[PDB]
Amino acid sequence: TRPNHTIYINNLNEKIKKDELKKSLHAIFSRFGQILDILVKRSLKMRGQAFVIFKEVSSATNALRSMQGFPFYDKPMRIQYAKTDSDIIAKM
RNA sequence: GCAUUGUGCCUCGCAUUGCACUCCGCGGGGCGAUAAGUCCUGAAAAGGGAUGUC
Ligand SMILES: Nc1nc2c(ncn2[C@@H]2O[C@H](COP(=O)(O)OP(=O)(O)OP(=O)(O)O)[C@@H](O)[C@H]2O)c(=O)[nH]1
Numbered sequence: 001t002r003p004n005h006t007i008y009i010n011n012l013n014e015k016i017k018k019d020e021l022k023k024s025l026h027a028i029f030s031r032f033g034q035i036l037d038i039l040v041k042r043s044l045k046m047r048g049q050a051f052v053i054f055k056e057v058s059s060a061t062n063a064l065r066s067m068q069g070f071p072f073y074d075k076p077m078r079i080q081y082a083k084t085d086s087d088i089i090a091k092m
Numbered sequence: 093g094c095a096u097u098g099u100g101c102c103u104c105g106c107a108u109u110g111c112a113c114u115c116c117g118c119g120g121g122g123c124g125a126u127a128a129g130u131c132c133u134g135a136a137a138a139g140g141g142a143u144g145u146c
């Protein structure tokens with residue numbers, strides 16, 4: 001899948017509260033650069049998954065490559081590139 | 093306080109590995125509380141449920 005501004009993460013611990021799951025993800029991936037938003041819902045379609053929207057695709061790539069399979073909340077993170085640009089990016 | 097309702101949150105059981113920004117699994121239970129909010133007020137960046145009826 002082609003490099004993107006947004007990394008799509010899944011195999012996440014569905015039992016983590018939404019507000020808390022976001023600030024973790026943020027605090028964690030801010031290592032690899034600046035973050036424009038994190039999209040997270042705990043709906044049936046969107047639980048266990050998250051969208052981290054980087055400012056620069058370089059950041060996302062280093063994030064994808066470094067944090068792949070990382071032990072996060074007793075599960076190994078599965079990180080791909082998003083299949084499409086996030087809305088906040090296309091409006092630019 | 094009772095009716096209807098928008099919008100999101102938390103928990104438990106079963107279920108779910110799911111590509112979103114067009115956003116609600118089923119079922120118990122608990123929620124105006126800026127927590128959140130996809131809903132509302134305001135053109136000013138912030139703020140907040142609403143109509144009804146004692
Ligand atoms: N019967 C009746 N009781 C009310 C009403 N509003 C508040 N109460 C009383 O208020 C208690 C609940 O508190 P709240 O509803 O939070 O009061 P509030 O938010 O200031 O209510 P409002 O003044 O109507 O905006 C209840 O036990 C009621 O007895 C009302 O409109 N009718």
Ligand SMILES: Nc1ncnc2c1ncn2[C@@H]1O[C@H](CSCC[C@H](N)C(=O)O)[C@@H](O)[C@H]1O
Pocket residue numbers: 099100123124125
């Ligand atoms: N945003 C909010 N903050 C706090 N409590 C809320 C709330 N939205 C709804 N409630 C609670 O839910 C009650 C309405 S019942 C509505 C539940 C929900 N819309 C559903 O369809 O499943 C309110 O009287 C209060 O008990």
Ligand SMILES: [Cs+]
Pocket residue numbers: none
């Ligand atoms: Cs529920």
